[PDB]
Subunit: 594 residues, 2 copies
């Protein structure tokens, strides 16, 4: 339980994976998404005493052979006895012994096991020697990437040492490390070591279930790179994996050299990751340059949250291979409409249902502006689907435009023929009335961006929006008295604050004849309400006051708080009213520079 | 000071290095061994308001050209104006601009600066374009290892992004990142970008001050590897560095292919480390496999605690080069006596002063057993230096023996002809009377180990040590009565507890005639005091009770506490008395199995 020299053997619940370590102060952390059942006992070689907590007493060390029995491997001991390796590891020298546990021998192929028991003198001794090193090497001495010649024919032992502490030999993890023996050190490993493969390329060419994948490799000329030296991690999709793909998609990706090359590189890692090195979620950069998320649930390895791994830890000379049930497809190999996620499904479905899906050709370059599913209300989907189709046509571009390519004042051409204004702010980018969210992606034939609202290009100008509402009438007169009608009719970029007639009625119309006498002061009072450029409340960062220079030249302050626009610390009635040449914010009272 | 949108510009005290970041909650940490002077001001574009803490107000963004002046680069602005780049970066598009600060232009070579002012239309525009990217890329979008084509002739911009947050372009660090502009983003870099070198090999061959180093490379055939693609960090020793070496050492290392190859690889890193990425101490694995410790003191880069770096951040296509004043010599390229550290100096000096230094040949393989300087007392160095030389001859072996090659019961042959017994325990390794410390190293021609005490091979056997002290007399008789004289005379491994005659006098000699009648019980009582194998108190782990099986078969317990051996929880008088065939522990009372 607790005390000196107490060792804890953890087993991940629902799995056969076991971790042995000294009982420290903090190891109740769960591994691979599951908690563990712990088994407390004296560390091997240590003994309990009467009336004493823990195991204060220790037994003298033995040689490597006796240590095999000390660490709990009876089967490795017996095979060492039958092959007459016992007398070597009891004798003079220094030996590191990587000893499969009893379970590890149980999991060995029965024909291979009886095949080793068939010849004890040669084959069994050669395998056990393949498990050994000519000098004593503790776990700290086993460094990631080391290739250590074994005691049989100088067979390479491929060492991996990971930040989490996992140490593996040919991807076999060391459960119980550093058992000190007079003759050397004994480590217990979770599997029996096997002959190393020629290379990843040779395994792909030799394997029939990789027949599909192999083909694609030869098309991308990336198979030759997998036959040279290195440390790789290859997730190999099986024939089942390619047959699980939608019809024609594999043909379309194979027909394109860039899509095939990127697809291939997306399955490869530049480092050697054994399955036993994964205790949880992590991100790895593939050779394509996008990252895959590798994790574990129980004993099942997960890739991008899905568990595709059936056969794992196939160790070759140049790296490790894990078989997967699916095909990892990077965004760079995907058609644009395939870049959409969960929150775009409605959009993704609508363009498919209303006949715009076929309109995105593989030979073209397109941009999807995709409102989230929350941006489609019931009243929206209640409209006649042909008007809805016209609205969706404003969300598709016939040119690919990346998020890094956008700029303020840019105009985009929808496939529906209309024009979208781009407004770039410091913290936000808003196309027409709708502003972008995070999560833009770029595919093979185009790019996709995500919007909070449905994009509705403004059909009416400033002047038209002014003369169509009665509450603005007086103000419009003043704007026409200022000779600003031509500005309100013609295109441009403007931010206009419109006081309602309710604001002029606060002056009881007598200040209208008072200020009607001033020709110059009317120009100041009016021009203070107009600012160059379009500034909408959705684009501001919340809580921040915005200092803008009006066309009158005096400063005006715009602060969006709780999705409510405040102009000079006065709450606006209506805000963000989009026109063709500008934006309108309706205010309660008449504005003065002050 | 404090508030919203407050930005802090730190300057490392005693250096011109500057770091700009938003005022967060914790950045008072010192950089590169020194504290910083901080300058608080509103983040560019943000403004103070009356009665408000911090800078709650923000100004609208400008284009890239205006942002140059916003971020504080007037010189980049002026050069952009003179080359007519201004009208491009004020216009339509999306531009990332890496803008040298004013200081960065000041540090540019005056002939290069006036040389750019000489032609504004072509050369200046081509350099400024070499500082720019065709799309907007924030610092998070700049990934380590990226090569991004610039806007002049698709010149590669080599991006590096380090865990500490440092982002560099051609090793130029970005002081102020992510200034958002309508036309793109502006980053401020600490130096003017320059033409990238052909490769590291080409720079070595072109440089005369590397003439020495270049030669060694061609001898090790590692120069061709430095001409291929990759990301490297090369610390290049100058001609001064090789001339600073002891005479004949460079010739000896060059004459040996393994020493030269390891020496060369020890100067190379497999990753690109810019000088500006170093905020403090870190360890890096070289191509030789040993690690070098890289750090910084002020603006001086340190390697292995020494500051050898004068010229730094020489950027080529395949990596970076930093010039060093010394030659990094790995242990694998060193002669054995050169492996000694500070605490071995006395030993290192003694073998040199008494004539044993020349006795270690480059053609041989040797092992040094080196006591720490504290292991030489005044009385030790007061003895005649020829006897001292005989003692040192027991500390040298004519065969190389690694720490991983040692095993219990091994016998070593000193060059002085004597023989050393090796005792391997679980937590300790003791040669004869002295036990090993940490810090063993392996060199080219041998290995070195560190000991707490001077090794003194035992000259007397158990029987001789017994009959030469009177206090043991009675006990010796009993041992001879048990027919154990032949065991005490002949070689072996034994642990013997010797009760003094003071213990038998506690029985008043009447129990000597009482127990003298029993022939069988005397064998038990006597044989309980003898155990097979040599167990010394220095080798035990402190506080741990040791269960040993005596040659009588009953258990005995040995616990070393406060450097005092306790046998069955009884403090021994004298402990760890070394003989040829065993060890003697003197006890106060007679021992019984109980
Ligand atoms: Ca370790
Ligand atoms: Ca175990
Ligand atoms: Ca704007
Ligand atoms: Ca960042
Ligand atoms: Ca700055
Ligand atoms: Ca021993
Ligand atoms: Cl489970
Ligand atoms: Cl541990
Ligand atoms: Cl947990
Ligand atoms: Cl137990
Ligand atoms: Cl035990
Ligand atoms: Cl070896
Ligand atoms: Cl672990
Ligand atoms: Cl371990
Ligand atoms: Cl050993
Ligand atoms: Cl992990
Ligand atoms: Cl998703
Ligand atoms: Cl339809
Ligand atoms: Cl994008
Ligand atoms: Cl891009
Ligand atoms: Cl933005
Ligand atoms: Cl309307
Ligand atoms: Cl327009
Ligand atoms: Cl003002
Ligand atoms: Cl300093
Ligand atoms: Cl920041
Ligand atoms: Cl500090
Ligand atoms: Cl300020
Ligand atoms: Cl400012
Ligand atoms: Cl580009
Ligand atoms: Cl930083
Ligand atoms: Cl930064
Ligand atoms: Cl932009
Ligand atoms: Cl650092
Ligand atoms: Cl030192
Ligand atoms: Cl001498
Ligand atoms: Cl060593
Ligand atoms: Cl070695
Ligand atoms: Cl040890
Ligand atoms: Cl003596
Ligand atoms: Cl001996
Ligand atoms: Cl007992
Ligand atoms: Mg043992
Ligand atoms: Mg076993
Ligand atoms: Mg491995
Ligand atoms: Mg396949
Ligand atoms: Mg594994
Ligand atoms: Mg949607
Ligand atoms: Mg009105
Ligand atoms: Mg507009
Ligand atoms: Mg608003
Ligand atoms: Mg700006
Ligand atoms: Mg400047
Ligand atoms: Mg760089
Ligand atoms: Mg040189
Ligand atoms: Mg740098
Ligand atoms: Mg010394
Ligand atoms: Mg006696
Ligand atoms: Mg002995
Ligand atoms: Mg002692
Ligand atoms: Na012991
Ligand atoms: Na703004
Ligand atoms: Zn303005
Ligand atoms: Zn024993």
């Amino acid at each position: 339980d607790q005390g000196p020299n107490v060792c804890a053997l953890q087993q991940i619940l629902g799995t056969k994976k076991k971790y042995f370590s000294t009982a420290k102060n903090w190891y109740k952390k769960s591994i691979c998404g599951q908690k563990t059942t712990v088994l407390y006992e004296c560390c091997p070689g240590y003994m309990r005493m009467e009336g004493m907590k823990g195991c204060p007493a220790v037994l003298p060390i033995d040689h490597v052979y006796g240590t095999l029995g000390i660490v709990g491997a009876t089967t490795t001991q017996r095979y060492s006895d039958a092959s007459k390796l016992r007398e070597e590891i009891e004798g003079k020298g220094s030996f590191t012994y990587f000893a499969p546990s009893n379970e590890a021998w149980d999991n060995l192929d029965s024909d291979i096991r009886r095949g080793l028991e068939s010849n004890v003198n040669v084959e069994l001794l050669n395998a056990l020697h393949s498990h050994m090193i000519n000098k004593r090497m503790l776990t700290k001495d086993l460094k990631n990437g080391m290739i250590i010649p074994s005691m049989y024919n100088n067979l390479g032992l491929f060492i991996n040492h990971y930040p989490n502490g996992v140490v593996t030999v040919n991807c076999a993890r060391i459960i119980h490390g550093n058992q000190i023996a007079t003759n050397g050190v004994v480590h217990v490993i979770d599997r029996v070591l096997t002959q190393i493969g020629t290379s990843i390329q040779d395994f792909i060419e030799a394997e029939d279930d990789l027949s599909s994948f192999r083909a694609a490799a030869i098309t991308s000329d990336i198979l030759e790179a997998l036959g040279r030296d290195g440390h790789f991690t290859l997730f190999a999709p099986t024939n089942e994996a390619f047959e699980k793909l939608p019809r024609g998609v594999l043909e379309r990706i194979m027909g394109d050299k860039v899509a095939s090359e990127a697809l291939m590189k997306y399955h490869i890692l530049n480092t050697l990751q054994c399955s036993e090195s994964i205790m949880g979620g992590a991100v790895f950069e593939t050779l394509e340059g996008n990252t895959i998320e590798i994790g574990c649930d129980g004993d099942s390895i997960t890739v991008n949250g899905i568990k595709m791994v059936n056969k794992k830890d196939i160790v070759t000379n140049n790296g490790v291979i894990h078989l997967i049930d699916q095909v990892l497809i990077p965004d760079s190999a995907k058609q644009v409409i395939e870049l959409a996620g969960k929150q775009q499904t409605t959009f993704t479905d609508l363009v498919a249902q209303l006949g715009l899906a076929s309109a995105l050709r593989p030979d073209g370059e397109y941009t999807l502006l995709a409102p989230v599913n929350n941006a489609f209300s019931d009243d929206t989907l209640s409209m006649d689907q042909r008007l809805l189709k016209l609205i969706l046509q404003n969300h598709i571009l016939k040119v690919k435009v990346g998020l890094n390519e956008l700029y303020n004042g840019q105009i985009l051409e929808t496939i529906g023929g209309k024009q979208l204004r781009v407004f770039v702010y410091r913290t936000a980018v808003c196309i027409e009335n709708s502003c972008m969210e995070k999560g833009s992606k770029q595919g093979r034939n185009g790019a996709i961006h995500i919007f909070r609202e449905i994009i509705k290009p403004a059909e009416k100008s400033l002047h038209e929006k002014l003369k169509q509402d009665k509450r603005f009438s007086t103000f419009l007169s003043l704007l026409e008295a200022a000779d600003l009608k031509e500005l309100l009719t013609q295109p441009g970029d403007w931010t206009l604050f419109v006081p309602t007639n309710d604001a002029f009625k606060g002056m009881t119309s007598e200040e209208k004849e008072i200020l009607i006498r001033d020709k110059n002061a009317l120009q100041n009072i009016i021009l203070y309400h107009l600012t160059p450029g379009v500034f909408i409340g959705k684009g501001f960062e919340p809580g921040v006051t915005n200092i803008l220079k009006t066309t009158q030249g005096s400063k005006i302050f715009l602060k969006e708080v709780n999705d409510t626009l405040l102009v000079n610390e006065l709450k606006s009635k209506e805000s963000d009213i989009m026109t063709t040449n500008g934006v309108i914010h309706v205010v309660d009272k008449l504005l003065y520079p002050a």
